[PDB]
Amino acid sequence: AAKDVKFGNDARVKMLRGVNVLADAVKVTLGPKGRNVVLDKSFGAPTITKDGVSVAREIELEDKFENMGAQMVKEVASKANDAAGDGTTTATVLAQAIITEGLKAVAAGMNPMDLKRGIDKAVTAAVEELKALSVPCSDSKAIAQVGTISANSDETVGKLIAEAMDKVGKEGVITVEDGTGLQDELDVVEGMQFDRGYLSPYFINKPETGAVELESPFILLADKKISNIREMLPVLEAVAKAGKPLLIIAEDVEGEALATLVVNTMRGIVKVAAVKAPGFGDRRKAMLQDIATLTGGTVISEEIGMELEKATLEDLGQAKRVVINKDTTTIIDGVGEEAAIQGRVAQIRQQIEEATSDYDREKLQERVAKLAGGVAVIKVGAATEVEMKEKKARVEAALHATRAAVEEGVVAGGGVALIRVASKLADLRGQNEDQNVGIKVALRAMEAPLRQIVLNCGEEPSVVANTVKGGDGNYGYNAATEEYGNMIDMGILDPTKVTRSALQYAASVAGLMITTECMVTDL
Amino acid sequence: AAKDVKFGNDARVKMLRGVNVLADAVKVTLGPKGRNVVLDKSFGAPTITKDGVSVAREIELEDKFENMGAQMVKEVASKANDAAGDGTTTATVLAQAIITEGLKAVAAGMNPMDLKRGIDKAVTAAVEELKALSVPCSDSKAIAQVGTISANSDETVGKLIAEAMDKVGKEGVITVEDGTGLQDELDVVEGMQFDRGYLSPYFINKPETGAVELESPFILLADKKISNIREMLPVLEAVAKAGKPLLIIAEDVEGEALATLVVNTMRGIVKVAAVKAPGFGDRRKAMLQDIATLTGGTVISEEIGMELEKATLEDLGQAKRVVINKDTTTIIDGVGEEAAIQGRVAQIRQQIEEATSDYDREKLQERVAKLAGGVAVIKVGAATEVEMKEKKARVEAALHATRAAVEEGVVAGGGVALIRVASKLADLRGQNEDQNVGIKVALRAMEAPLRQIVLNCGEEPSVVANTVKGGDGNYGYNAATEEYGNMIDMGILDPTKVTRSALQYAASVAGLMITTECMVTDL
Amino acid sequence: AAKDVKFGNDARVKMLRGVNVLADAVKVTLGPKGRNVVLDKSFGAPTITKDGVSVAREIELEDKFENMGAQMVKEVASKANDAAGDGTTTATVLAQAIITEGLKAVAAGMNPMDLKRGIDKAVTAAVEELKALSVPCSDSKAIAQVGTISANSDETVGKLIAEAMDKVGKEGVITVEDGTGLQDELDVVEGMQFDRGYLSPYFINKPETGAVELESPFILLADKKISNIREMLPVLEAVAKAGKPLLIIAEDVEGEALATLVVNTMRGIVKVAAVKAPGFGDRRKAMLQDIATLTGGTVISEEIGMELEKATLEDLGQAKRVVINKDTTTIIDGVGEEAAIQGRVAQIRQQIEEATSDYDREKLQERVAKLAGGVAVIKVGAATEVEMKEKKARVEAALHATRAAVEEGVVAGGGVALIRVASKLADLRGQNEDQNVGIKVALRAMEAPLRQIVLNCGEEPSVVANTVKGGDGNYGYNAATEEYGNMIDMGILDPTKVTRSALQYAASVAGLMITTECMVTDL
Ligand SMILES: Nc1ncnc2c1ncn2[C@@H]1O[C@H](COP(=O)(O)OP(=O)(O)OP(=O)(O)O)[C@@H](O)[C@H]1O
Ligand SMILES: Nc1ncnc2c1ncn2[C@@H]1O[C@H](COP(=O)(O)OP(=O)(O)OP(=O)(O)O)[C@@H](O)[C@H]1O
Ligand SMILES: Nc1ncnc2c1ncn2[C@@H]1O[C@H](COP(=O)(O)OP(=O)(O)OP(=O)(O)O)[C@@H](O)[C@H]1O
Ligand SMILES: [Mg+2]
Ligand SMILES: [Mg+2]
Ligand SMILES: [Mg+2]
């Protein structure tokens, strides 16, 4: 079953109360003045983390309708999180701001659909304007700063990510592991990364992220593509011994060879993942060799024409870790000696001398980049296990945000980017008055992030907001030092990606909420 | 179990209260001014859809008798929905209007049976009069408009359906799929559609609609009719490999061949559907070939006399999708090359030159139409999964209504058609006064839809109603612009089919409700 | 599920109340004036032990939030206990002191993060300063005193530990067993200890401490490394007879031999642990022989080149007890005669005469130390089983603390060390006022231990504190005699390790607690 059915105003006030409890609990957290949130545990000491996200996860309300409103806006943070891995609190205060004024306009008699249309138009133009302002990333200091800011005042994690990207760039892979010990640790181990993915998706390992991950696995470099089981038999058994995954790098991922791997790892003997030698055609064989040289068992190549059968137990290689993902196959560390690797480099280096053309030159540079690009490993600091798991989360998000920042650039942080955008949209209008109110609702909500940051400092939101709007460009308020200045020069940046995402998800959920004619729930 | 038994007036007031709660919740929704309904979910954010239907599904009342009244009238929307796929809200306000005045007349002492007879007579004549007024559909713009109107202000879905029907007409099949991505998408893939249905009803797949649906299935064109298992063995095994359905298009659906398909797909090996080559006799073989040319493996024909055995692995064909239904067998996309297809066209095109007669000419044109008629695919827009599933529903209904409109035409929308009909019946009378009151009850209820649309706009129902009744023809009120004008010229049309259905189901359930001498329910 | 969510001050007062109940219950206990705590049992008489730890284990509160605060600070004692095995009560009063003033500062409006930073800085410098003051241990009387003090006024246990360490030093192993009878017991049985650990981490026995323990096991000294099963067959069967564990001491722990032991003890026949002959290379064989001479079956050596097969049933040796751990393999008691042992000593003693060099001299001395170093066994006094199990705990902790004291020295007890450290940090400052308050909070809490000890005596904390701070160095208050004096001269010492640990864990948990923006718990 029997349902309770309402109609009219009574659903709106319920929703609003529910989003307010959630947003108010979450938004404090934001702003350096407030610090941490505690999250209760059934056993032992509570968790202390400054996660807006950590706070949101705990919010559930008694009133069924208020709880619905809270769970709905909670979707904002989660989507912003999944998409950018940062800015969930910012997204939550933007949503509350849009929902609050939007529902007030509805109560005033304004058309919900028009309000939503206006909000949408403002967000569409705001995003374009955000792209126009955003400017790209810089060297490791800037990367560290952005990372720190995106991790909420962990400058350590910020530096780590910046250094890791300085080593491998985007190209290498960057990974995060629990720390070997209680320090933030950043080290480049020989990542060779080449562009497959796995085959049968059924190779997916623990990483729910749609990847696979092997630790100290063995690496069969079938250089030729694998003809026979026979050729595999020796390596498959070496991998049969437990804890040693096997990674098959044959000329392409086979039928024959692949089919066997799928069946064997299907029966629990020798878990195993397969990927092609990189590229196509000729370069494929040359690349399959670069992997051999890196993982130490240098297989007599496909280029040579020698087979997997040629490939042997010597052929098998090994690395502390290998991941095969959306990106690639990435081998982290490698048996292959630097001697062999650096020697291989010298070879290809002459190839470029000999090579008549640019094409051969391009193809060679592609190989050196893959084989030398390497990989950067971020170990979250540790001791105790709780703090270690927490810092790991921050490093993960900070990395994600910084990566985005590097691609298309970051914008002034401290909520000033959205304020500059809002001021540029002062003349934006819609098809009618109600749509115009919706536009204004959105532009007003764009000041909320800066205002909450200031409020958390113990300062006056309107005064600081008024002063920032007074200047222009990167002029903003540094909440850490409580001084005005050039946000970029002070190193307070936000990846354009997280700002954009926070705004779009906030407007999206807000738009939905806005129109509720009738509500139905269990009695 | 022990029952509670009432009698007399007390059942009527209960029913009326129950239909009022349901109808009032539903009818707001209707009218552009009101927007969406929210439907609560046990997990996550509520659903926002503007579905009268969505609202009705949630309505259940505490008082057992009131709940009975609500569940009864709820049958109106569901039947109108099943029959026309649109107009459920319109049907619900017509029912409430008829039930309300009808029960009042009963309370006044009027004979229930006569009241029902009068209502029935008015509806019978009204439907005839509705047919007299209705006028047929037009080109893609009109189709888009009607579709939009039938989808409640989704002009996008309206355009899609209109374009899809412009491509294949009625003849081709039109289908709807979840969008590949988050856009309304409309594309014609080579539908060849021929008239069967499936040899065994036990071939129905998941589509509860009594159709079976295969994705990228293999197509055996047994041109000759299939003699042997032997001939099937090769194709059956190719289909044995999983995910590839098999579609058997042999000269007719067999015994021999059919029986095998029924047994094999019965054991989970090679799921499989069979249909005849189209038509009978000679044309059958020629048509079975058109399918071959379309699905790419051109089987040596029955016309030739070559067999299924002649037919091979080359013979097997393939298409992204095939549906076998009430309509036909429809192959969407096809392996068969345009080269082959267009060449086949040229052949038959000369056949028409050579052909002595009209008969041969007709038969040939039938084949080109089937092979060229093609098929239109409507992809509801996507991102996120919720909105995507919703828009898909709207496109489905809009399509259904527009299809009906194209067949026998549409009538002025905005509730004006029923108002014109009602005015034409002002002199209608029955066998007695009570029957006359029933007639008047029905004619009065016919104004309800226009009045509710206006009420939802925030305007005055009586004033607008009075003004529309004042003019005539397609003169009506445009609720979107709040201007009077020619409904047809403004593109506000309703398929005559949904209007007729809404009225008949409303009168039908209303008639039933009207007479309740005694009521029995569980204690 | 549903959660209750609070925010603001209300979490802090709850936490504080919870830590106060726990700390107040625990801190009495500390100080000689108060004696014991009773712990209720479901059956029989209550347990009487003076364990702060015993009291903490029983603390659970009704109010869910207060209980959380109690369980959180309870983590302080447990970690200090795991790390130093003493000073849990001291750690608890330091935590209460830091938490109390820290939360007061927060309520006053001070920045939690800065408060925590200040506390952390003070603790970091305090620990450095603690190292500067600490001074190393001395002969058995001093060891006894420190042990007694660390065991809370069991001078008996103190003497035992001191004597045990005087026998074997650190080098020998010291162990604790339930008393054979109701006395503090203390005896050196021939421990020969060398550094392995176990070949397989699946040899771990009852001892949860990550060790193995065998009673009267048989000792196979495979001097040569074990080639064959054949060689093992005789000894494996002798060990097959039950209750006699087998310890394999072959040239190294094998593959061949090791693999067999893992499989056999895996099937419940002959439980068995394997360890290498000590060292590498040549010295390995010589050392493997020292074990033979000690466990009585002197195996024809690896040095000789004779094999396990050479080794026989005579070869097998036996000892009341053997433990294989983090430290080593340690054989306690031995079949091997003193005749053989002392004779072996004479041999190696001449080796030193002959030996040309220092290297050979060093290697030989290493062997005599291992073979003669011996082992000290501490039997907690007994009758009745309850008291016996209790005294055993005290001896274990006292031993642990005294061992730490011997390594890097002890500091003045009675809480004076922390008071001296605090006075040396009077000018320590941070980045801002809030950080300065945090520093002061920590320095103030450092007086808490001495103040509680005095309070438990029935004296005035402020007066005694004031007087101790008045003097300097090891000047302190002897709570047993209620006289001031030189803490070291009076034998009141604390291992620097327990003092350091108590302070760090107290500050660590206190720091966490301090910042709670919001709290979430089950309804
Ligand atoms: N010194 C500073 N002055 C002003 N604003 C700052 C400063 N440091 C960081 N910020 C801003 O705070 C926001 C990022 O903090 P945080 O990561 O806590 O927010 P969030 O990402 O929304 O919350 P969460 O990380 O839990 O999702 C950004 O807009 C950032 O620019
Ligand atoms: N611009 C307009 N002016 C007047 N009436 C309009 C306008 N647009 C649509 N309508 C009318 O609204 C009705 C269709 O809307 P809707 O689909 O919401 O009603 P419904 O089909 O009864 O509800 P549901 O689709 O949930 O069953 C039609 O009678 C249509 O002509
Ligand atoms: N004669 C004494 N005068 C002053 N203080 C003393 C005296 N004897 C012991 N103490 C002090 O009491 C403390 C050790 O006692 P105790 O072991 O009870 O404390 P605890 O280790 O914190 O509690 P628990 O052992 O249950 O963890 C030390 O700081 C020690 O120096
Ligand atoms: Mg963040
Ligand atoms: Mg409709
Ligand atoms: Mg103690």
Author numbering:
A (entry chain G), B (entry chain A), C (entry chain F): 2 to 524
Paper text:
Currently best understood is the bacterial chaperonin GroEL, which assists the folding of nascent or stress-denatured polypeptides in steps of binding and encapsulation. The non-native polypeptide is first captured on a ring of hydrophobic sites lining cavities at the ends of the barrel-shaped complex. Then, the combined actions of ATP and the cochaperonin GroES trigger a dramatic series of concerted domain rotations that eject the polypeptide from the cavity wall and encapsulate it for folding in isolation, inside a hydrophilic chamber capped by GroES (Mayhew et al., 1996; Weissman et al., 1996; Xu et al., 1997). The process is initiated by concerted ATP binding to a GroEL ring, rapidly followed by initial contact with GroES, and concludes with additional rigid-body movements of the GroEL apical domain to form the GroES-domed chamber.
We used an ATPase mutant (D398A) with normal ATP binding but 3% of the wild-type steady-state ATPase activity. ATP-bound rings from GroEL-ATP7 complexes are termed Rs (single), and those from GroEL-ATP14 Rd (double). For the Rs states, the fitted models reveal three distinct new conformations between the T state (apo GroEL) and the GroES-bound state (R-ES), termed Rs1, Rs2, and Rs-open. When the apical domains of the Rs2 state undergo a further elevation and move radially outwards, all the intersubunit contacts between apical domains are broken, producing the R-open state. Although the radial expansion and elevation break the continuous hydrophobic binding surface, the movements place the helix H/I grooves (which face into the cavity in all the preceding states) into an upward-facing orientation (R-open) in line with the GroES mobile loops, allowing GroES to be captured, whereas the stretched substrate protein remains bound to the separated hydrophobic surfaces. To reach the R-ES conformation, the apical domains must twist ∼100° clockwise and complete their elevation.
